[PDB]
């Protein structure tokens, strides 16, 4: 009783279909998966080293989920101007209009330039996601459990910064479920926490205490596409939006 039509009072004629721009621009913008495989910024951070780190310590950690992180506006003094000004990207705006997903993701991590050190990246699909709080890029500041340490059995890859300071990887779907939730997650049970993100990506440097001083306050950006075999499987309508050019200007 949603898409019904009682009486269609057509006063129009036939309009020439362009095929979603394929006639004009040589490309059809109908398949939305083609749009979602364009990369979009997952996040950015400035590297900060509080305690003395070993070679095994991970530099930062983040859960890997397609509907985008908790929107990091930044500090009140120094806000991240991308997430503050133009609030959110295309891919989570599409993913807000669905409930469930199943499939892989694609992450492209861009490291700073003047660093040379060899970088390891692990994917741990063990970390359940406990609430929408702490669903963000987390600077590892201490090592108590096996979280900070480069572990053995996970899917890892090492990028040589001397050759190229960007890594391009594909995170697979490893949950034991039919789907996962595709909204701002509210933790009710313990089993529901296993089914939010695909896994948990930890990026670490092999630098020592002397070479880590050149890495402090350097930016690391993370981009993500949607991959392929990536299916959204329940239509949910959109939440209240916000208009972007109605936001106030930084007057002087």
């Amino acid at each position: 009783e949603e898409s019904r039509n009682t009486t269609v009072l057509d006063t129009t004629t036939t309009l020439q279909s362009s095929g979603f721009g394929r006639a004009f621009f040589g490309e059809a913008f109908n398949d939305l998966k083609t749009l979602m495989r364009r990369y979009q910024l997952y996040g950015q951070l400035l590297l900060s080293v509080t305690t003395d780190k070993d070679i095994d310590h991970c530099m930062f950690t983040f859960p890997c989920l397609p509907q985008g992180l908790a929107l990091d506006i930044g500090s009140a003094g120094s806000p991240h101007e991308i997430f503050n000004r133009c609030r959110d990207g295309i891919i989570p705006l599409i993913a807000s209009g669905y409930r469930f997903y199943r499939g892989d993701l694609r992450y492209k991590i861009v490291f700073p330039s003047n660093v040379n050190s060899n970088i390891w990246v692990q994917h741990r699909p063990d970390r359940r996601l406990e609430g929408w709080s702490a669903a963000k890029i987390v600077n590892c500041d201490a090592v108590s459990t096996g979280q900070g340490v480069y572990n053995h059995g996970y899917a890892s890859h090492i990028q040589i910064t001397r050759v190229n300071n960007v890594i391009e990887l594909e995170v697979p779907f490893y949950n034991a479920t039919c789907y996962n939730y595709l909204q701002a997650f509210n933790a009710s049970s313990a089993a529901s926490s296993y089914a939010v993100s695909l896994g948990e990506i930890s990026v670490g440097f092999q630098a020592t205490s002397d070479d880590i001083a050149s890495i402090v306050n350097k930016p690391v950006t993370i981009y993500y596409s949607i991959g392929d075999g990536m299916q959204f499987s329940q239509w949910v309508g959109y939440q209240p939006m916000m208009i972007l050019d109605q936001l106030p200007a930084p007057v002087v």
Partner: protein
């Protein structure tokens, strides 16, 4: 086009006869199906005796009745039922045990459940009354924290829903298949699943058009909701003493 009423009233009764329970409708149902028909999944994660009880579980049973009056504003929720919990909580709200209704006696003894649903939302409104309600189904309501800004008829019109007009006094049929992250919902306290037991989401009936009438018209009307579990499968035969009562809400 040629009316001729008699002692019967010149109508045409539509019947839903499902396991010795018969529902009658004068009007045509306004159906809405959110997802296609699910598959049985006893193959992949069960070795216990898996069997529905279609003679007692595919019956109709009321889970909510309420009074829609003219003192309700534009966007105001009337019902918000977490249906697999709402069946058991509607029985427990009548102050008895769950083993006194034949619809829910496998929930006392089994552990997990998967099956589709059929929801009938019947209004009893006068022909001169004017108003309209939504019957919107949402999968897994509690797993979204921004749903408190979502619960409105503007957002629920975007996903598919069933409209109930108070003038025609029509009826809303809701074919709800099983669509969840896990392929089974536990009926009781099970490992690493302590809260949100047997919750699949909220059927929430809100108002679009508030009930309008003359100065001396009939002020209120009644709405009754019936449920059916047709494509069920029960696995994990267990003791009934392990089962606990549902959260009251």
């Amino acid at each position: 086009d040629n009316p001729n009423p008699g002692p019967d009233g010149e109508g045409e009764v539509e019947l839903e006869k499902d396991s010795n329970v018969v529902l009658t409708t004068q009007r045509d149902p306004s159906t809405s199906i959110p997802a296609p028909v699910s598959v049985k999944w006893s193959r992949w994660t069960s070795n216990d005796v898996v069997d529905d009880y279609a003679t007692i579980t595919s019956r109709w049973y009321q889970i909510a009745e309420f009074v829609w009056s003219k003192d309700d504003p534009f966007d105001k929720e009337l019902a918000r039922l977490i249906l697999p919990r709402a069946l058991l909580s509607s029985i427990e709200a009548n102050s008895d045990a769950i083993c006194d209704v034949p619809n829910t006696i496998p929930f006392k003894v089994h552990a997990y459940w998967r099956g589709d649903m059929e929801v009938r939302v019947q209004i009893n409104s006068n022909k001169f009354q004017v108003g309209q309600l939504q019957a919107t189904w949402y999968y897994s309501d509690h797993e979204n924290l921004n749903i408190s800004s979502k619960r409105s008829v503007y957002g629920f019109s975007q996903m598919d829903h069933a409209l109930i007009s108070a003038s025609a006094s029509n009826e809303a049929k809701l074919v709800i298949p099983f669509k969840h992250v896990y392929p089974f919902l536990p009926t009781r306290i099970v490992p690493d699943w302590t809260t949100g037991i047997l919750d699949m989401g909220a059927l929430n009936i809100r108002v679009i058009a508030p009930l309008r009438m003359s100065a001396t018209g009939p002020t209120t009307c009644n709405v009754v909701v019936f449920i059916k579990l047709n494509n069920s499968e029960f696995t994990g035969t267990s003791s009934g003493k392990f089962y606990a009562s549902q959260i009251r809400a």
